[PDB]
């Protein structure tokens, strides 16, 4: 392998897709950013570490820009009104095989699949009802 | 509507799919568990809260068990050998439009799409490199 | 989806049926109340909690009023002359599958079925003999 | 005449029906037990007492076992892997006529009737939602 | 019944009406919001509780956006310059029948009817004179 | 003008309508009471105050009595068996235009229109569900 490569973060069906590319590897933390100012960029970082004697942990973080009414290349303050932050932590016991790990990835793909409760709630600015 | 519906958490192509159904809404925490003894069930919970004056925060958790049968005191009990835990928090500014919110959902879907860096590392007990 | 809906508590053929409707779900205690004066209403509450490491416990309560009018100083109010209080607690180990729980439910329906010892004793102001 | 007789606790069509038979009536506590090993038997007890000046109170209890075999040192015994414990108390004022008691009984049968909220929650290892 | 449904909050005669739809039910508090960002949304919430031994209380809250000079989807600060808050508390004695309650609703409909003092004062940025 | 005029608080279709008339403006609190002994009258009060440098707050109260005749000391007195109290506060920013204010009035009128969720729950001694 060598998985540290560019990938499509937001798939808008070929036209206006957001591609994110490797931008930093300081300390083993892989970083990927879109082609924007760092204030308006889509950013992804990922690292693994053995959290304890029985677990390995993946720390994945994603920053997404508020796009509606955005001024490209502009200075938009406060920073907090213009950015969403996603923080994921995946704890996996050292006994998990590649197969066990593949199933965990499917559980994550299903949780966020289109039409399911969680992504529908988020996209509609809602909770569960 | 009522977005509090069942969904398939793990899609094993119509056969051995893991579907999860609504099971509790006590204390404002929506819960969904699979059809199993509570000792072996998959569990998904979601709650939203106005974390600050200008934010809303969704807390989502998924538990994927590794089921086993354990002999305790000479008797067999349905049990989970271990569990994998996903904990996610998503903070969204109150200024985010529904289309701004659909953007966050797609980003999360693209992040875990098969073939992309992150779900590839996880499924292979590997880090990003 | 919801099971927090109205239902017929007392079935009197299809007329004079007592229907209890959702009223409040504060702190994990679901409450249902019949219509008209809250003072003469039937009441049902239900909650579940993990009573211990291996047990989940339901606490169900029902109140059946003896509907009456109170006249004091010529001012009459709709009241309940008195009430019966049913308090039940059901402890179920976390090892119980859905099948096991369905059996527990049949055991409860069988206990109270018409003609059986217990519902006959109650219905006739009696004990066992 | 007697109401201290055997009855079907669990009706499974006409076969696999669990029948509970009188066993002991010491100190005002009537007891019923199913056949075979007392260790794997169902148990029902019932008593009535004048709880206070105006109230009579019934204390009914039911135990549903999880039938299993215990093997220790090669010696196997018929045991109950675990048990659910139903404990109910019904308080009825001495002013209740037979008609009033019959209504109380219908209220109890209605609460547990198939399809209603409570028996559905229990049968599915759930709470209210 | 099942009254938790979408309704027209602001009737502008079919064209440009504001519809508000169910968006949250955490803790028994029903919420309805319009299709906007949460900062610019019309929001309604409602809950009932027995406030004391003799009263039931409804807590209804409504948030209305300042529409003149509004930038749809924009970040408008301070939040307080752009929102009106309505807070209603209805205390009803447990003796109130459905009929008594219907009259209370009429008293509320009359108080706010078009052309009456209170709604005229509010709409004209005035007090009473 | 002078918006301090009488109006019909409860419209019972021209017959048994409850009209309320101006009765006091002492201390800047406009008051309106129905044609009854002060012990049995409906009462409506309204006051506006510049609650903050940038807000104005209207405080409105309505009292709906349940009239009765009570025998005190062997003598009959016109009395109110009980009273229902509505307390509303509406905070409006000083930046709100008259059309912004007409928007708040319509929202309040739509909220209580017959058939909508809230006035339906209230009139039925029910919560929202």
Coordinates of C-alpha atoms in Angstrom, one line a residue, chain A residues 8-121:
Chain A
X8 CA -12.7 13.1 -3.1
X9 CA -14.2 14.3 0.2
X10 CA -17.5 15.7 -1.2
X11 CA -18.9 14.0 -4.2
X12 CA -21.1 16.3 -6.2
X13 CA -21.2 14.0 -9.2
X14 CA -18.0 15.1 -11.0
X15 CA -18.9 18.7 -11.3
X16 CA -17.9 20.8 -8.2
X17 CA -16.5 17.8 -6.3
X18 CA -14.2 18.7 -3.4
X19 CA -10.9 17.0 -3.6
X20 CA -8.6 17.0 -0.5
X21 CA -4.8 16.4 -0.9
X22 CA -1.9 15.4 1.4
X23 CA -0.5 18.5 3.1
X24 CA 1.3 17.5 6.2
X25 CA 2.8 14.5 7.9
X26 CA 4.5 16.1 10.8
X27 CA 4.6 13.6 13.7
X28 CA 2.9 10.8 11.9
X29 CA -0.4 12.7 11.8
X30 CA -1.5 12.6 8.2
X31 CA -3.3 15.8 7.0
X32 CA -5.2 16.5 3.8
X33 CA -6.6 20.0 2.9
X34 CA -8.6 21.4 0.0
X35 CA -7.3 24.1 -2.3
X36 CA -8.3 27.1 -0.2
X37 CA -7.1 29.4 2.4
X38 CA -6.7 27.6 5.7
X39 CA -9.6 29.5 7.1
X40 CA -11.9 28.3 4.4
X41 CA -10.4 24.9 3.7
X42 CA -11.9 21.4 4.1
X43 CA -9.4 19.6 6.3
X44 CA -8.9 16.0 7.4
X45 CA -6.3 14.6 9.8
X46 CA -5.9 11.0 11.0
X47 CA -3.6 9.1 13.5
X48 CA -3.4 5.7 15.2
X49 CA -1.9 4.8 18.5
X50 CA -2.1 2.0 21.0
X51 CA -4.3 3.8 23.5
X52 CA -3.8 1.1 26.2
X53 CA -2.6 -2.4 26.5
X54 CA -5.8 -3.9 24.9
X55 CA -6.8 -1.2 22.5
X56 CA -5.6 0.7 19.4
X57 CA -7.3 4.1 18.7
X58 CA -7.8 6.1 15.6
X59 CA -8.3 9.8 15.9
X60 CA -9.9 11.3 12.8
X61 CA -10.8 15.0 12.6
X62 CA -12.7 16.8 9.9
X63 CA -13.3 20.6 9.5
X64 CA -16.0 21.7 7.1
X65 CA -16.5 25.3 6.0
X66 CA -19.8 27.2 6.1
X67 CA -20.4 27.8 2.4
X68 CA -23.6 29.8 2.2
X69 CA -22.9 33.5 1.9
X70 CA -19.1 32.8 2.0
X71 CA -16.7 35.3 0.4
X72 CA -14.0 33.3 -1.3
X73 CA -10.6 34.4 0.0
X74 CA -12.2 36.8 2.4
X75 CA -11.6 37.4 6.1
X76 CA -14.6 36.0 7.9
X77 CA -14.9 36.5 11.6
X78 CA -15.6 35.0 14.1
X79 CA -14.0 31.8 13.0
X80 CA -16.5 29.8 14.9
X81 CA -19.5 31.0 13.0
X82 CA -17.9 29.8 9.8
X83 CA -16.7 26.3 10.6
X84 CA -18.1 22.9 11.6
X85 CA -15.8 20.4 13.4
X86 CA -16.1 16.6 13.4
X87 CA -14.1 14.6 15.8
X88 CA -14.1 10.8 15.6
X89 CA -12.5 8.3 17.9
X90 CA -12.4 4.6 17.0
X91 CA -11.2 2.3 19.7
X92 CA -10.4 -1.2 18.4
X93 CA -9.3 -4.2 20.7
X94 CA -6.0 -5.7 19.7
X95 CA -7.8 -9.0 18.9
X96 CA -9.6 -7.5 16.0
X97 CA -8.5 -9.2 12.7
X98 CA -8.6 -7.5 9.3
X99 CA -12.1 -9.1 8.9
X100 CA -13.3 -7.7 12.2
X101 CA -12.0 -4.3 11.1
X102 CA -13.7 -4.5 7.8
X103 CA -17.0 -5.0 9.5
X104 CA -16.4 -2.0 11.8
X105 CA -15.9 0.1 8.6
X106 CA -19.2 -1.2 7.3
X107 CA -20.9 -0.3 10.5
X108 CA -19.6 3.3 10.0
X109 CA -20.6 3.4 6.3
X110 CA -24.1 2.3 7.3
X111 CA -24.5 4.7 10.1
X112 CA -23.9 7.6 7.7
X113 CA -25.6 6.2 4.6
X114 CA -28.0 8.4 2.8
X115 CA -31.6 8.1 4.0
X116 CA -30.7 6.7 7.4
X117 CA -31.8 8.5 10.6
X118 CA -28.5 10.2 11.7
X119 CA -27.5 11.7 8.3
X120 CA -31.1 12.9 7.8
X121 CA -31.3 14.6 11.2

